[PDB]
Structure formats: structure tokens, C-alpha cells
Amino acid sequence: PASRNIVVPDAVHAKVGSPDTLPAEILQKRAQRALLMQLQQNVIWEGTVISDER
Amino acid sequence: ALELYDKWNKRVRRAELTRLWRKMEKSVVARIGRITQVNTRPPTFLLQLQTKNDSNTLPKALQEMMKNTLVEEFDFRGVPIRLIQEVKD
Amino acid sequence: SRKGMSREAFVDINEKGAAWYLGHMQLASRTLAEKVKDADFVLEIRDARLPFTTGNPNLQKIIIDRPRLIVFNKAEMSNEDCNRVIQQYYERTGNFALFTSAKRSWRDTVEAVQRFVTHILPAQRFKTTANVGLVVGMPNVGKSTLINSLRLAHEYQFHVKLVPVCKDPNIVLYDSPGLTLPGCFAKEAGLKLAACGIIPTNDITLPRSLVARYIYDVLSAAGVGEHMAECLHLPRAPISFDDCISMICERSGTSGQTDLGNLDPSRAQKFLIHDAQLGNLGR
């Protein structure tokens, strides 16, 4: 039993760029960057071009 | 006896002393940067301390260990060695 | 157990005492590079079950010139084919690799370090000096235990963190307490470490239910259900994680709690009842 070897296929392993693989700090930082940019668009800030819609 | 006198009058290189001190520091207060052999007949080594606090000298255990290292490396076996703790100014 | 944050993922033992290093290894990358530069060789201690996850990415990314010896503990637990391929990879590289079981990592690792220093490490310009090796590894893997053993030996003999190994050829080891700690980690990495047993499981942060579900998922993906059933001694190969838990509880006893039976797969995985691995690589 123990002597028997097991080969894990690469399919089960999560993708390198997946949010699960990425640490939570990076995801939170990107979300907060998006929120700050949204706030800057909502309230007219200097150097902010309104290139979006809605 | 003649060999002991020759060791007493022996000279050491400043570069060798500095490399030995660097290796000792990596192998095992205020550090020192320059070590030189000032006197010749009794081998005396001047070690400079990187601090202006005149009372922040080296521990006696540390200086004895340094003397033992010098004796072991440069073959000052039967020759006494002296150290001088100097502070920058 | 109940407490959420795992201490072993942040804590280590320096000279003054316990410390809680914070942040990711990329922050320490510079200090680690300086330590390796001022050292003479590198001794990396990693876990064979998840080698590339235990290792410090910054070390391999920044320093490759200095000679390095990697010690993969729990080799018997780890898969043989992966061990051999990574050993060949390291042999092609300028570093060295050594796979060790319990007693091997206990003493044969020191013996191999002495052999490495004698054979490949150049000769110093002096004799009283010492060859310095920077030790890099997670304390829970066994680096902390080795450092503590050397510390006790040196203290008994007498009766920055440098621990001597042997008088000849005057080998000493520098300690790196918190340069390769997990700290914050991804969900998949945390699950892998918990399955390997290097990070204790908690009822809040990462439950045993999730850990065992991940173990079952990876085993099913590998397609080893029948062998897992045979190892666990349960009658027939399971079809689901819940079915496996129920079978384990039935085997254990009539009054088999779900959590009690779910705790057994993790212990078996840690105890090598199944031989597997969790980690990728490139060629």
C-alpha cells in the first residue's frame, strides 16, 4: 500500500494565475485600486479623464 | 629559544590581519575595522573601534579569544601578544 | 485548535526569543541575498512531499552562484519518481540534493554537510577560520529542531546566530529565523500544508472537513480510489467524500462521530498510509 506510488495529474492543480493561487493580499489590493479609481471617476479629480460610460 | 626570539621579532601583514579579523567576525559591542601590528619586538596589535564612546571597549573574554586566534594563525605560540583598544576621533 | 490564526506560520525562535515575522518573502529577499553573499555556502531544508512549496522562491530567484545543498525531509513519504527527477534537475544545476528519512535528516544530513564541505567547498586561506553555511528553511520542517540540537550540543560542550557542527573542518551554520515562513498563504497552499501536517488545522480558518475534502479530491483526480480503500481497510471503493467518511466511521465503530472519522484520513496522510505528493515544476 504505502510502497505503491501515486502520480497526481497536473489537471487537479489550480491554474497559476487563478485567484485561489494568488495570495489574498494581491486580490484585496487590486479590488481597492479599482474602488479608488471608481471614486476618482465619480468625483472629478485632477488628471482624471472620463473615458468610461454611465 | 632562537625560534621564540624570531617569533618575538616577527612581523605580520596588515591585509592578512584584516582578512583574518573579517573571517573571525563571520565565524563567531562595537565592531572593529582596522587591525595593524604597531610594535615589533613584543608583537602588539592595534584594533580600532567604530565608536566614539571612550568606555565602550571590548570584553576581556573577546580580546583573549582574539589573542588566541592570532597565536594559532600566525604561529605566535610561545610569544605573548598585546592588544590596544582605540576609538575613533 | 479552536483559535483561528495558526502560530507556526509566523513564529520562529531567534537568539533573544520567539518572534512573529510578518509579510511575504519578497520583502526579505534583499536581506536573504545579503546573508547568502556574506556566507560561504547555503544549506536549504525543505519537505519532500511539497518541495517547491516549502522552498523560498526569492533565494532561488536571486542567488544561484553560491554552492547550495538541499535536504528533502520525509523522502519516504514523498513520491519516488518526483524525487528522482528533481534530484537529476539539481545535479544538472550547480547545487546538490539529498533525500532523507527521519533518522537521515537527524544525523546523516550533518554527515552529508561535512562531506560536502570537505569535498567541493574550497580551502580557506587560514585554518582557525570557519566555513559558514546559511541555513534556510521553515522551522516546522526540521530546521528549528536541527538548530536547537546543535545549540544544545555546543552549550553542553562549553559547560547573529552561529552554531558549530564539528571541529574539523571548522563548519558553522548561520541561522535565518524568519526569512522563509509561510505567513499569509493561498487557499490551495494552505490546504496542501495542512494535509502535509506542517500547519495545524483549525475549526475556523481551515477546517478538517475542507482539508480532508481536498485530500479526497486530489486522490480521486489521481484515480487511486481502490488503493485508498484498500489502505483504509474499508470494504468497497467509495464514490464520494461523504461516502468515504461514512465507511470510515462504520469501520471505526457503531458510535463513530463524523468529525472523529474525518480526523483519520488526515492522520493517515501524515503517517504515509498513502504515498502521494502535491506540487508542480518545469521540466
Short mmCIF file of C-alpha atoms in Angstrom, two decimals:
data_model
loop_
_atom_site.label_atom_id
_atom_site.label_comp_id
_atom_site.label_asym_id
_atom_site.label_seq_id
_atom_site.Cartn_x
_atom_site.Cartn_y
_atom_site.Cartn_z
CA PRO A 1 0.00 0.00 0.00
CA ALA A 2 2.44 2.69 1.16
CA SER A 3 5.15 1.41 -1.19
CA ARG A 4 2.78 1.96 -4.12
CA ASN A 5 3.41 5.31 -5.80
CA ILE A 6 0.69 7.77 -6.81
CA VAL A 7 1.05 10.27 -9.66
CA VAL A 8 -1.11 13.39 -9.36
CA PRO A 9 -2.14 14.79 -12.77
CA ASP A 10 -1.49 18.46 -13.42
CA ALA A 11 -5.21 18.95 -14.13
CA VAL A 12 -6.20 18.92 -10.45
CA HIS A 13 -3.60 21.58 -9.61
CA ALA A 14 -5.10 25.06 -9.79
CA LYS A 15 -4.05 27.44 -12.55
CA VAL A 16 -1.05 29.64 -11.81
CA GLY A 17 -2.95 32.89 -12.39
CA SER A 18 -6.05 31.74 -10.55
CA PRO A 19 -7.34 33.90 -7.68
CA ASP A 20 -7.13 30.84 -5.42
CA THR A 21 -3.41 30.51 -6.16
CA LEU A 22 -2.86 34.25 -5.81
CA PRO A 23 -2.48 35.42 -2.19
CA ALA A 24 -5.45 37.29 -0.76
CA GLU A 25 -3.34 40.43 -0.30
CA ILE A 26 -2.95 40.91 -4.06
CA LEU A 27 -6.67 40.39 -4.67
CA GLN A 28 -7.62 42.88 -1.95
CA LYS A 29 -5.10 45.41 -3.29
CA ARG A 30 -6.49 45.13 -6.82
CA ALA A 31 -10.07 45.45 -5.56
CA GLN A 32 -9.18 48.54 -3.52
CA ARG A 33 -7.35 50.06 -6.50
CA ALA A 34 -10.48 49.54 -8.60
CA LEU A 35 -12.64 51.12 -5.88
CA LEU A 36 -10.33 54.13 -5.61
CA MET A 37 -10.37 54.63 -9.38
CA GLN A 38 -14.17 54.40 -9.34
CA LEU A 39 -14.30 57.04 -6.59
CA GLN A 40 -11.95 59.32 -8.53
CA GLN A 41 -14.16 58.96 -11.61
CA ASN A 42 -17.31 59.62 -9.56
CA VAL A 43 -15.90 62.83 -8.05
CA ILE A 44 -14.00 64.86 -10.63
CA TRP A 45 -10.33 64.66 -9.67
CA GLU A 46 -7.35 66.30 -11.39
CA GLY A 47 -5.81 64.31 -14.21
CA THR A 48 -8.89 62.06 -14.39
CA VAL A 49 -10.25 61.56 -17.91
CA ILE A 50 -13.86 60.34 -18.13
CA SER A 51 -13.26 57.67 -20.76
CA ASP A 52 -15.95 55.34 -19.39
CA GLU A 53 -19.75 55.36 -19.64
CA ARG A 54 -22.60 55.53 -17.10
CA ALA B 1 64.93 29.69 22.24
CA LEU B 2 66.18 31.14 18.94
CA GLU B 3 62.87 30.28 17.26
CA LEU B 4 60.99 32.00 20.09
CA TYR B 5 63.12 35.13 19.65
CA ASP B 6 62.48 35.04 15.90
CA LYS B 7 58.73 34.80 16.53
CA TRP B 8 59.02 37.67 19.01
CA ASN B 9 60.63 39.84 16.33
CA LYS B 10 58.36 38.51 13.58
CA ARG B 11 56.15 40.81 11.51
CA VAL B 12 52.64 40.34 10.11
CA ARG B 13 50.84 41.88 7.13
CA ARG B 14 48.00 44.36 7.60
CA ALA B 15 45.95 42.81 4.79
CA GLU B 16 46.34 39.37 6.36
CA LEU B 17 45.29 40.73 9.75
CA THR B 18 42.21 42.41 8.27
CA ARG B 19 41.17 39.28 6.38
CA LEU B 20 41.67 37.14 9.49
CA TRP B 21 39.55 39.53 11.55
CA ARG B 22 36.81 39.56 8.91
CA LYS B 23 36.73 35.76 8.81
CA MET B 24 36.66 35.59 12.62
CA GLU B 25 33.79 38.09 12.76
CA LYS B 26 31.85 35.99 10.25
CA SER B 27 32.70 32.78 12.13
CA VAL B 28 31.80 33.85 15.68
CA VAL B 29 29.50 45.57 21.48
CA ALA B 30 31.24 47.78 18.92
CA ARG B 31 32.97 46.14 15.97
CA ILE B 32 36.45 46.98 14.66
CA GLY B 33 37.53 47.75 11.11
CA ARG B 34 41.30 48.22 11.19
CA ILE B 35 43.83 45.87 12.80
CA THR B 36 47.55 46.55 12.49
CA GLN B 37 50.77 45.44 14.18
CA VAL B 38 52.28 48.58 15.70
CA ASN B 39 55.25 47.34 17.73
CA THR B 40 57.75 44.71 16.59
CA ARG B 41 59.78 43.25 19.48
CA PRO B 42 56.72 42.44 21.62
CA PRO B 43 54.03 41.81 18.99
CA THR B 44 51.34 44.40 19.71
CA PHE B 45 48.23 44.73 17.54
CA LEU B 46 46.18 47.93 17.38
CA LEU B 47 42.46 47.37 16.84
CA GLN B 48 40.27 50.40 16.13
CA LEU B 49 36.72 50.57 17.48
CA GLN B 50 33.92 52.05 15.36
CA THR B 51 32.51 54.11 18.23
CA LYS B 52 33.33 57.43 19.89
CA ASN B 53 32.30 56.24 23.36
CA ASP B 54 35.68 56.02 25.08
CA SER B 55 34.42 53.47 27.63
CA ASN B 56 32.87 51.07 25.08
CA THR B 57 35.96 48.88 24.79
CA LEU B 58 35.97 45.14 24.02
CA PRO B 59 35.28 42.41 26.60
CA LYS B 60 38.32 40.75 28.12
CA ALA B 61 37.00 37.37 27.00
CA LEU B 62 36.71 38.67 23.44
CA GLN B 63 40.22 40.11 23.47
CA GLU B 64 41.65 36.88 24.90
CA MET B 65 39.89 34.96 22.14
CA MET B 66 41.37 37.34 19.57
CA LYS B 67 44.85 36.85 21.03
CA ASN B 68 44.39 33.07 20.91
CA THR B 69 43.27 33.29 17.28
CA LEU B 70 46.35 35.35 16.40
CA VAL B 71 48.62 32.88 18.20
CA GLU B 72 47.02 29.93 16.41
CA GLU B 73 47.13 31.51 12.95
CA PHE B 74 50.42 33.44 12.82
CA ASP B 75 52.42 30.96 14.95
CA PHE B 76 52.99 33.28 17.92
CA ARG B 77 52.86 30.13 20.04
CA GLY B 78 55.50 30.83 22.69
CA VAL B 79 55.28 34.61 22.25
CA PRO B 80 52.96 36.87 24.28
CA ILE B 81 50.70 39.24 22.36
CA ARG B 82 49.29 42.64 23.27
CA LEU B 83 46.17 44.48 22.13
CA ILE B 84 45.27 48.17 22.20
CA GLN B 85 41.61 49.26 22.11
CA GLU B 86 41.43 52.52 20.16
CA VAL B 87 38.37 54.66 19.48
CA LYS B 88 37.98 56.98 16.51
CA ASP B 89 38.29 60.75 16.91
CA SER C 1 -7.42 24.09 17.57
CA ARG C 2 -10.29 26.50 18.20
CA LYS C 3 -8.06 29.55 17.79
CA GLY C 4 -8.10 30.76 14.20
CA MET C 5 -4.69 32.06 13.17
CA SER C 6 -2.00 29.38 13.11
CA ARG C 7 1.11 30.39 15.04
CA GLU C 8 3.57 28.05 13.30
CA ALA C 9 3.06 30.03 10.06
CA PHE C 10 4.50 33.21 11.62
CA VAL C 11 6.56 32.23 14.66
CA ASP C 12 10.19 31.16 14.92
CA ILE C 13 12.97 31.19 17.53
CA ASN C 14 15.78 33.76 17.39
CA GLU C 15 18.54 34.18 19.98
CA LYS C 16 16.55 36.60 22.14
CA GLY C 17 13.38 34.52 21.90
CA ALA C 18 10.22 33.90 19.91
CA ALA C 19 9.38 36.42 17.19
CA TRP C 20 6.47 36.95 14.80
CA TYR C 21 7.84 37.89 11.39
CA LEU C 22 5.22 39.44 9.11
CA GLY C 23 4.96 40.00 5.37
CA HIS C 24 5.95 37.95 2.35
CA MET C 25 9.36 36.54 1.46
CA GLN C 26 9.83 39.10 -1.33
CA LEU C 27 10.23 41.78 1.36
CA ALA C 28 13.13 39.88 2.95
CA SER C 29 14.63 38.93 -0.44
CA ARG C 30 17.29 41.65 -0.10
CA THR C 31 18.35 40.65 3.42
CA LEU C 32 18.41 36.99 2.38
CA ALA C 33 20.61 37.83 -0.61
CA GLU C 34 23.00 39.80 1.62
CA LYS C 35 23.13 36.92 4.11
CA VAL C 36 23.95 34.42 1.37
CA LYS C 37 26.56 36.76 -0.12
CA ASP C 38 28.35 37.18 3.21
CA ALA C 39 28.06 33.44 3.91
CA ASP C 40 30.18 30.73 2.23
CA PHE C 41 27.60 28.07 1.32
CA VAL C 42 23.85 27.52 1.67
CA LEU C 43 22.01 24.67 3.40
CA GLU C 44 18.33 24.61 2.43
CA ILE C 45 15.95 22.33 4.34
CA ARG C 46 12.67 21.51 2.61
CA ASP C 47 9.89 18.92 2.74
CA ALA C 48 9.99 16.22 0.07
CA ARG C 49 6.19 15.99 -0.07
CA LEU C 50 5.82 19.60 -1.32
CA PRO C 51 9.37 20.72 -2.14
CA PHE C 52 8.67 23.72 -4.37
CA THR C 53 6.05 24.94 -1.88
CA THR C 54 8.38 24.64 1.12
CA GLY C 55 11.29 26.33 -0.63
CA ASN C 56 11.95 30.06 -0.62
CA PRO C 57 11.32 31.48 -4.13
CA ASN C 58 13.46 34.56 -3.52
CA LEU C 59 16.57 32.51 -2.73
CA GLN C 60 16.39 30.54 -5.98
CA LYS C 61 15.47 33.69 -7.93
CA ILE C 62 18.30 35.89 -6.60
CA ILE C 63 21.26 33.63 -5.69
CA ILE C 64 22.36 30.61 -7.72
CA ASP C 65 26.12 31.19 -7.73
CA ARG C 66 26.87 30.22 -4.13
CA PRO C 67 27.02 26.44 -3.58
CA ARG C 68 23.78 25.12 -2.10
CA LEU C 69 22.79 21.76 -0.61
CA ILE C 70 19.07 20.94 -0.38
CA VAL C 71 17.80 18.40 2.15
CA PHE C 72 14.36 17.00 1.33
CA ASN C 73 12.95 15.52 4.53
CA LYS C 74 10.17 12.92 4.57
CA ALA C 75 11.56 11.33 1.40
CA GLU C 76 9.80 8.04 2.15
CA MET C 77 6.53 9.97 2.45
CA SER C 78 7.25 11.74 -0.85
CA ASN C 79 6.88 10.03 -4.22
CA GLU C 80 9.97 8.36 -5.64
CA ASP C 81 9.66 9.45 -9.29
CA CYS C 82 9.38 13.14 -8.42
CA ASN C 83 12.32 12.81 -6.03
CA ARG C 84 14.47 11.25 -8.75
CA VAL C 85 13.56 13.79 -11.42
CA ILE C 86 14.18 16.78 -9.15
CA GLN C 87 17.44 15.18 -8.00
CA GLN C 88 18.55 14.93 -11.62
CA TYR C 89 17.48 18.54 -12.16
CA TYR C 90 19.60 19.69 -9.22
CA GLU C 91 22.56 17.57 -10.35
CA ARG C 92 22.36 19.26 -13.75
CA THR C 93 22.26 22.51 -11.80
CA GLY C 94 25.26 23.52 -9.71
CA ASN C 95 23.52 22.67 -6.43
CA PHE C 96 23.26 19.34 -4.61
CA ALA C 97 20.21 17.41 -3.38
CA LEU C 98 19.79 14.81 -0.65
CA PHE C 99 16.61 12.95 0.30
CA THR C 100 16.35 11.95 3.95
CA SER C 101 14.01 9.99 6.22
CA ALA C 102 13.61 10.71 9.94
CA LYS C 103 16.97 9.39 11.17
CA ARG C 104 18.69 10.50 7.97
CA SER C 105 17.58 14.11 8.45
CA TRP C 106 18.56 13.65 12.10
CA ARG C 107 22.24 12.81 11.57
CA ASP C 108 23.04 11.77 8.01
CA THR C 109 22.23 15.33 6.92
CA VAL C 110 25.06 16.63 9.12
CA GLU C 111 27.31 13.86 7.82
CA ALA C 112 26.50 14.83 4.22
CA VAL C 113 27.10 18.51 5.01
CA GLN C 114 30.54 17.61 6.36
CA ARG C 115 31.24 15.52 3.25
CA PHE C 116 30.12 18.39 1.01
CA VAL C 117 32.35 20.89 2.80
CA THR C 118 35.35 18.55 2.66
CA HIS C 119 34.89 17.60 -1.00
CA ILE C 120 33.59 20.55 -3.00
CA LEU C 121 33.91 23.60 -0.75
CA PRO C 122 37.29 25.27 -1.44
CA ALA C 123 40.00 25.52 1.19
CA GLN C 124 40.14 28.68 3.28
CA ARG C 125 43.19 30.94 3.26
CA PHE C 126 43.57 30.30 7.01
CA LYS C 127 42.96 27.45 9.47
CA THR C 128 41.41 28.97 12.60
CA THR C 129 38.61 30.43 10.46
CA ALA C 130 35.38 28.54 9.78
CA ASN C 131 33.29 27.68 6.73
CA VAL C 132 29.89 29.33 7.18
CA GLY C 133 26.65 27.91 5.82
CA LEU C 134 23.43 29.92 5.82
CA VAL C 135 20.53 27.67 6.86
CA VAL C 136 17.28 28.42 5.02
CA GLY C 137 14.08 26.55 5.78
CA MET C 138 10.77 26.58 7.54
CA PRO C 139 11.26 25.95 11.29
CA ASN C 140 8.45 23.38 11.44
CA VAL C 141 10.09 21.28 8.70
CA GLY C 142 13.02 20.43 10.98
CA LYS C 143 15.41 23.34 10.57
CA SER C 144 14.46 24.61 14.03
CA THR C 145 14.96 21.16 15.56
CA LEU C 146 18.39 20.82 13.96
CA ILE C 147 19.43 24.29 15.12
CA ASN C 148 18.22 23.57 18.65
CA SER C 149 20.09 20.26 18.74
CA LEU C 150 23.31 21.94 17.62
CA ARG C 151 22.74 24.72 20.16
CA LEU C 152 22.31 22.19 22.97
CA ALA C 153 25.43 20.29 21.89
CA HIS C 154 27.52 23.47 21.84
CA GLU C 155 26.12 24.63 25.19
CA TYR C 156 26.95 21.27 26.77
CA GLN C 157 30.46 21.40 25.29
CA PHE C 158 31.01 24.86 26.78
CA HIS C 159 29.53 23.78 30.13
CA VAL C 160 23.83 36.84 14.96
CA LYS C 161 23.13 33.12 15.41
CA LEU C 162 26.05 30.80 14.62
CA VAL C 163 26.01 27.12 15.60
CA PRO C 164 29.10 24.92 15.10
CA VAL C 165 28.82 21.49 13.51
CA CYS C 166 32.23 19.85 14.00
CA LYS C 167 35.72 20.98 14.97
CA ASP C 168 37.10 19.79 11.62
CA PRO C 169 36.85 21.27 9.01
CA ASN C 170 35.50 24.01 11.32
CA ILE C 171 31.97 24.18 9.93
CA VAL C 172 29.47 26.67 11.36
CA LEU C 173 25.88 27.45 10.40
CA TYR C 174 24.17 30.84 10.33
CA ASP C 175 20.51 30.84 11.34
CA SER C 176 17.79 32.56 9.29
CA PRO C 177 14.80 32.61 11.66
CA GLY C 178 12.01 34.30 9.70
CA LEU C 179 13.13 34.60 6.08
CA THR C 180 11.11 31.69 4.64
CA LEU C 181 7.99 31.49 6.80
CA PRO C 182 4.60 30.87 5.12
CA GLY C 183 2.81 33.80 6.71
CA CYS C 184 -0.23 34.63 4.63
CA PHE C 185 -0.79 31.94 2.02
CA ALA C 186 -3.17 30.99 -0.76
CA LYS C 187 -6.08 28.64 -0.10
CA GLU C 188 -4.54 25.84 -2.16
CA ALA C 189 -1.14 26.25 -0.50
CA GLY C 190 -2.75 26.26 2.94
CA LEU C 191 -4.70 23.11 2.13
CA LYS C 192 -1.54 21.38 0.89
CA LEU C 193 0.41 22.37 4.00
CA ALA C 194 -2.41 21.28 6.31
CA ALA C 195 -2.61 17.92 4.54
CA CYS C 196 1.16 17.56 4.91
CA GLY C 197 0.71 18.38 8.60
CA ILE C 198 3.12 21.32 8.65
CA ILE C 199 0.29 23.74 9.53
CA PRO C 200 -2.13 22.66 12.30
CA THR C 201 -5.78 22.65 11.28
CA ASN C 202 -8.31 24.96 12.93
CA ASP C 203 -12.09 24.78 13.15
CA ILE C 204 -12.40 28.33 11.75
CA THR C 205 -9.61 29.29 9.34
CA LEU C 206 -9.17 25.91 7.60
CA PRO C 207 -11.43 23.10 8.90
CA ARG C 208 -10.52 19.44 8.92
CA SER C 209 -13.58 18.93 6.71
CA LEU C 210 -12.07 21.10 3.97
CA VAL C 211 -8.61 19.57 4.41
CA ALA C 212 -9.94 16.01 4.07
CA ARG C 213 -12.18 17.01 1.16
CA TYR C 214 -9.13 18.40 -0.64
CA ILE C 215 -7.19 15.20 0.08
CA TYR C 216 -10.04 13.08 -1.28
CA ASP C 217 -10.37 15.31 -4.34
CA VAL C 218 -6.68 15.03 -5.21
CA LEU C 219 -6.74 11.26 -4.68
CA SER C 220 -9.82 10.89 -6.90
CA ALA C 221 -8.20 13.05 -9.58
CA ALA C 222 -5.14 10.80 -9.41
CA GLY C 223 -7.54 7.87 -9.81
CA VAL C 224 -6.41 5.92 -6.75
CA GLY C 225 -9.78 5.26 -5.15
CA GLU C 226 -9.47 1.48 -4.97
CA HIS C 227 -5.96 1.65 -3.49
CA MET C 228 -7.14 4.25 -0.97
CA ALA C 229 -9.99 1.94 0.03
CA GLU C 230 -7.60 -0.98 0.44
CA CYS C 231 -5.22 1.12 2.55
CA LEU C 232 -8.06 2.36 4.76
CA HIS C 233 -9.33 -1.26 5.03
CA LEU C 234 -12.90 -0.18 4.23
CA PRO C 235 -14.81 -2.87 2.28
CA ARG C 236 -15.58 -1.29 -1.10
CA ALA C 237 -14.16 1.65 -3.02
CA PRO C 238 -16.08 4.84 -2.12
CA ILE C 239 -17.90 7.05 -4.60
CA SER C 240 -17.97 10.36 -2.69
CA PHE C 241 -16.20 12.11 0.17
CA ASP C 242 -19.28 11.71 2.36
CA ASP C 243 -19.42 8.02 1.46
CA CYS C 244 -15.77 7.61 2.43
CA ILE C 245 -16.41 9.36 5.75
CA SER C 246 -19.38 7.09 6.44
CA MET C 247 -17.34 3.99 5.60
CA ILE C 248 -14.53 5.14 7.89
CA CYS C 249 -17.00 5.75 10.73
CA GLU C 250 -18.59 2.33 10.22
CA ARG C 251 -15.18 0.65 10.24
CA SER C 252 -14.13 2.52 13.38
CA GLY C 253 -17.30 1.67 15.28
CA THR C 254 -21.05 2.00 15.55
CA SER C 255 -20.75 5.25 17.54
CA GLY C 256 -18.39 6.84 15.03
CA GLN C 257 -18.67 10.62 15.06
CA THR C 258 -18.41 12.30 11.68
CA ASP C 259 -15.57 14.54 12.88
CA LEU C 260 -13.85 11.59 14.57
CA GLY C 261 -13.90 9.62 11.32
CA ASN C 262 -12.89 12.67 9.28
CA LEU C 263 -9.83 13.16 11.50
CA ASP C 264 -8.50 9.74 10.46
CA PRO C 265 -7.76 10.41 6.76
CA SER C 266 -5.57 13.39 7.71
CA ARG C 267 -3.62 11.30 10.23
CA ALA C 268 -3.21 8.55 7.63
CA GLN C 269 -1.95 11.02 5.03
CA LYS C 270 0.54 12.42 7.54
CA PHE C 271 1.59 8.89 8.57
CA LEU C 272 2.16 7.71 4.96
CA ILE C 273 -0.75 5.26 4.75
CA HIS C 274 -0.94 6.64 1.19
CA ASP C 275 2.09 7.72 -0.83
CA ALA C 276 1.42 10.87 -2.86
CA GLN C 277 2.68 14.40 -3.47
CA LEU C 278 1.38 17.94 -4.04
CA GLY C 279 3.48 20.17 -6.28
CA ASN C 280 4.29 21.15 -9.87
CA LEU C 281 7.52 22.08 -11.64
CA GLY C 282 9.03 22.76 -15.05
CA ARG C 283 10.89 20.03 -16.95
#
